[PDB]
Symmetry: D3
Subunit: 250 residues, 6 copies
């Protein structure tokens, strides 16, 4: 390997300069298998990497793991291997009543409720997406008729207390996070997820391009158990969007 964690060499990327970065290994394969000549490059730790080809150009798909720390490793090491543009795709829960299940969210910037972002810039620096990445994601969403919302995402270092879940071992949320969700919702924040504050700050502060899209599988203000088919469909639409954005950015 040329890098400490990912198990990749430079020539494995075959000159690729853009990576799609979902959180989980299983989603990596789903994305790669929508492109041409997909091949699995490595699986080490939370980092599963495939390569594929979009209109004859190599693209990398690499899982970050959950959370800013592992995201920050994957981004640094892909950047040492020549990636310059990073597009995150996820599935997510909306926290606004007007957002419906199956809609698509493109994130302009994130609330920094993480710690890794601070290791690249002080908290005053905005966790903001690159404008060409956000443009390409919005255009790609439009290209398939998706209902798209464009706006702020809250990016949390935890899945449970940081997102005000109370059905937990302790049933407790620390005072600084208790009632925080209501604050984000009053400020128009669309959803929570767990990697973007890190991803967007570290790229924006390091002259790398990054952007994020997600499909909505649950709305916590009108909460239903998701249907398996609907989740598969929404995941696939967000996967097409991020791939089509990739095509516009190359």
């Amino acid at each position: 390997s040329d890098v400490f964690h990912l198990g990749l060499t430079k020539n494995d990327l075959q000159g690729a300069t853009l990576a799609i970065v979902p959180g989980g290994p299983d989603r990596v394969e789903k994305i790669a298998a929508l492109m041409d000549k997909p091949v699995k490059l490595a699986s080490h730790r939370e980092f599963t990497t495939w390569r594929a080809e979009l209109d004859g150009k190599p693209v990398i798909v690499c899982s970050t793991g959950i959370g800013g720390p592992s995201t920050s490793i994957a981004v640094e090491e892909l950047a040492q291997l020549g990636i310059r543009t990073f597009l995150r795709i996820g599935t997510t829960g909306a926290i606004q009543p007007h957002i419906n299940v199956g809609d698509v969210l493109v994130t302009t910037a994130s609330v920094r409720l993480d710690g890794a972002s601070l290791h690249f810039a002080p908290l005053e620096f905005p966790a903001v997406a690159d404008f060409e990445c956000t443009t390409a994601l919005v255009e790609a969403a439009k290209s398939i008729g998706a209902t798209t919302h464009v706006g702020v995402t809250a990016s949390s270092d935890t899945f449970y207390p940081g997102q005000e879940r109370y059905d937990t071992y302790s049933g407790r949320v620390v005072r600084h996070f208790k009632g925080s969700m209501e604050e984000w919702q009053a400020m128009g924040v669309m959803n929570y997820e767990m990697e973007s504050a890190t991803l967007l700050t570290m790229c924006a502060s390091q002259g790398l391009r990054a952007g994020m899209v997600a499909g909505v599988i649950v709305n916590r203000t009108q909460q239903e158990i998701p249907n398996a088919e609907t989740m598969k469909q929404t995941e696939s639409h967000a996967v097409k969007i991020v791939v089509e954005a990739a095509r516009r950015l190359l």
Copy 2:
């Protein structure tokens, strides 16, 4: 007057929902002059307001004064009078070597070196521009052939120490700000100015749209003294851009 500071009634705006918001009263007249049927509404404190018409729709031009506090009053009061979209235009000094005098900067989000932003959202919330305003401004800039840079601005509550100016009465900059400019340069920040962290945070957290464009009049990394014609022609150019963007947002 329907509001505490600006000296305006609801009727004065004639149903306008968009305002262009420069910092100084003198630029208000320059902008309103590009549009049809320009009329002066009011001048109180740093707040000078004109109305004009663009493609048959009324549009407001109102000066903010320097800094987040006066900006916060102008935006709140114009929101109570029905403004939903706010476009800031300025002239500015670049802090990157690759940006030239006469180029145009469109701000995707700002470093919050201000205090009024904190009165609307905690510091972890991004001072992020509206995507439709940012798109309208970049497209407008490209439409008249501007050389355009799109990215992060540092937004300071001072002109002098917070922008690391040392030719001052004391010649001193407080420890937290000394060497901060080199940090923002390393992080790819384009420029400093003094109203956008407040304007962008307050609009983003209250469901108002905002965006900002500026024309470059000096580069601090290769600093030349500008002549009056350079400054006038750069101001004209940014003013043309912001009016063209207002046209696409109406």
Copy 3:
């Protein structure tokens, strides 16, 4: 001009070393017209400057604009033109039940709810008035029989959320400021205004003298609509106080 914003040259001040600094341009003229040989020097942006003469000595009167950012510009540039003492005068709303409309408040130090003060000293540094300025203001108040309170002022970068006003576009105050007014009132804070934390910190940390007086036109704990005559009278008394303090400091 010798300075970037104010439009003043050194010799325009005719050797003046003290400036009275109200927030608004209209009040500048009212103060200057109580002294001898008043002349308007400049009006640019929020900065309206007059000169006058008190017992044969030149005094400057210069509006700061609203907020610490513009205050910080006016102070720095007047200091480069030789001013060493700065007295702010305002009209204000009291937040304590025992303070009556028409009473006079002299501020010993301010709660720093601003951002510009941080560009001169870290938050632990007190936004404290010069003792000879505060002495002269208290003595001047006594010299006209005013009812005087001497104590702390809360200095906010916003007029609306920072002062817990809820009759606003959004009707919302961010969590960190919601219930803050009750905290200041329990701590004996007399009133809010919007320039003193900046003014007092930047002078105290730069070896310039500063102090502040204000007349009370409303009490928010027993809130009445002010009468026009009472406001004019209270404004004039505070204007006499600051001028008489000026006379004692020269």
Copy 4:
């Protein structure tokens, strides 16, 4: 699955109440192999879980992934499945000159350079290990003749800037972290790693027991490249220690 991420049911754990929690899935199998009746339970995302038996009692081995966010999910979900005791084992780089390759570190508490710890306790709360776990780990280490150091670890949300690595894409470390390593060295901090501030804070504040041991594979103050056998033998040693400590805690 009874839980959102790990892919486990309550029955799968067979009444286990103790888990050894390494960072990577590959080490899970190495640890489970030392114990009796090792069986694989589940592998989802960075979470690989085996069960085995120690002195006739079932014990869990589950990988956390890198960083506090994924660690926080694994601990919460294993707590909902009845785990009350969590023992982290790793390999690590020392930052003190007196620590040698092959020595073992047991962590009494950690410097919180992470973000997920903040989602359980404010920063003033100590990221402190359980005394019984720490005792079991030191006694286990001394039991096989390890050279043992017991003390403070720095726990970072990044591998690169937060541990002051400069051979990176940017070669830059943000101001707050530049020179931080020399501060932790002066303060007697033993090492860096990336999960313990979260693991220890969340357990200490929720009535769960946790502790951590690690084997030293590199010393950054006298840095040698390790061979594969050094790394395997150091890992074996720490793995033997953590299983021996689990035996004393059952």
Copy 5:
């Protein structure tokens, strides 16, 4: 004197390397009088120092005064006189329902609600006890059959608001401390006291050993007025524990 405050010379310690450090002067004599050859060395300010002999080795007993500032003086100056291990003993109020009056608490680490600790390490650094000191204290407690709890202590710079006492002059607790006790209790914190955050941080960060034991004289969740005999007895048991720990550490 060889030091600024304590009034001690180096040779007065007769080679002692360990100090027992209670808060009050009266307790100093009680401890020294349980050892051999006790002699009073000095009483200056809050700093009363005795020497005595444990199994033929000199030990110092030195009051810190109340609070981190005076603790930090006594620790620095005893360290300049050769002390390397510092054991604090106190009497305390428990804040957990399961802790009984007459039980003994050994502190693993402290919540840092003080200011002096910040003058040795940033807030992220844990106020953690030395593991050999905490071991010796737990073993010493066991050696006399005491009921022992081992865990976190909240260390406050105030006795009244910081510990949420409301029967005070003002009856007020500042917002940041109002409802804090309930947070510590939900996080398992055992008790409050006023010197350990300073003591533990400054020693842990300076390569000195420190630990703390206390006997419980009141439980604030089931609050009774303490009986004089019970307080004397519990004090004596904690004094024996700290002396017996001293013996194990020499």
Copy 6:
């Protein structure tokens, strides 16, 4: 005793409402000796209290101990016993070149480098002295011909690192404090001491009056070792001043 720490009953104070509060018990007797009918009340911990009579009115003299925590107890308990006015007197080291040995400093407000102030007001609140106490102290100083400086003091929770002393056990000062002295010097801060940020913040936020004077015994910018007579004569002078100020406040 009516209070937890000081060993005083309400009757002991004989209706006194003013206290002079030096740091050390030994200075209590020196101050009480200047007044009429001096009597010792109590000595517990660092708290030594005498009563005496000034112009026929009873006055209290009570030592605070070193640092905000013990100061906070003394002020709270003396407030419960009816003290409304507190005058601190000390001897101190100047940090400005223009201040001489034997000069007197009166403190208008303090830099909050302490922790107990935070238990009464958030850090943005000024640690400001009462105007009547400050006036009485300056007038008293001028009344006996002192050379008087009036201005800002830095108030530290430590004697050693927080005042940048390096001839210590470690010889190290933590990053946040290293170079802080030069910042306070640049900002015109007169001196360091260790009780006023707490004394002034707690009194200012609870409607109690406080002020502080000190005599200069060393100048750190031109540091001479003082002889015993210099120290005694400087102490006498400040003690005379504080008693004279108490006379004007009764």
